[PDB]
């Protein structure tokens, strides 16, 4: 009974990074080594664990977080990183245990004239906590003067479209990202690597 990773990796549309999706996976066999050795993924980095170790471990739940960012932001999906994605959109803990997977999605997520569906948060009063998801849309007050519902000097809308076009340079092309995290509860540990099965 193989984990339905297809539903996450092969989804026709992905979330905007500010409104990132989380899929719970349970009651199945996960082959992390087959994922790791796949040529479909150009980024595959594990923290606190490796794919060989995950092949020999059982968890209660696995979470697959997924979203789209531009290529030059892929480096921000790691512990201890700064920049607008890590600070304001999607944050890993310093002590992260799990895997960051990414691939170029220019053929799916870019459009002639721009794909404006994908957004990210450009501004926030403080940094996100790990695994926090902020979908708020209030004017960002960049200075001491209240905005009172009006955009202008130091009063900005907090979300920005990417507008992916196929001709973008690779740093500005869309990348699909999946982050795997692992949960152990006092409950049956029903997500297992093939060795612990």
């Amino acid at each position, epitope marked *: 009974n193989l984990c339905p990773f297809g539903e996450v990796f092969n989804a026709t549309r992905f979330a905007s990074v500010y409104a990132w999706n989380r899929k719970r996976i349970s009651n199945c066999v996960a082959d992390y080594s087959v994922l*790791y050795n796949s040529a479909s993924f*150009s*980024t595959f980095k594990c*923290y606190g664990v*490796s*794919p060989t170790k995950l092949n020999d471990l059982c968890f209660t739940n696995v979470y697959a977080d997924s979203f789209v960012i531009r290529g030059d932001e*892929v480096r921000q999906i790691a512990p201890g990183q700064t920049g607008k994605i890590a600070d304001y959109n999607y944050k890993l803990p310093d002590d992260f245990t799990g895997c960051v997977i990414a691939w170029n999605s220019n053929n799916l997520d870019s459009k002639v004239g721009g794909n404006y569906n994908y957004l990210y948060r450009l501004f926030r009063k403080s940094n996100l906590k790990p695994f926090e998801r902020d979908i708020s849309t209030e004017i960002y007050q960049a200075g001491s003067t209240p905005c009172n519902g009006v955009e202008g000097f130091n009063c900005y809308f907090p979300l920005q479209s990417y507008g992916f076009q196929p001709t973008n340079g690779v740093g500005y092309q869309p990348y699909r990202v999946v982050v795997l995290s692992f949960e152990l509860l006092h409950a049956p540990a029903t997500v297992c690597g093939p060795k612990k099965s």
Partner: nanobody
Amino acid sequence: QVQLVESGGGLVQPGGSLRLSCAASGFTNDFYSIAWFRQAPGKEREGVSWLSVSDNTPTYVDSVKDRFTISRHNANNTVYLQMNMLKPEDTAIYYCAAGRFAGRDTWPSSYDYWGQGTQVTVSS
């Protein structure tokens, strides 16, 4: 603290072989991975081979698959890239890079530790 020492480059004829070496010092433990990035004339740095050290898993791009072998010798904490059946296309400055993760990335910006390059030239 962490340092990568690169060597092994030179001039070879098309068809020749070369053995690049990356010596990693200031790591506590085996939980890092190495990448080899080549920078051809007028191109950006591009990944060609990865080694996840703790798992000992190699990865190669398709264009070097059967010609290039990456490996590690435990004793001297050194990762080797054996480059066989070299073509003129393989001419570039080769960099090794390290990150505190198990795996691989095509983005140079994802690697915080870099050797000084070694020049590889393949012509007649």
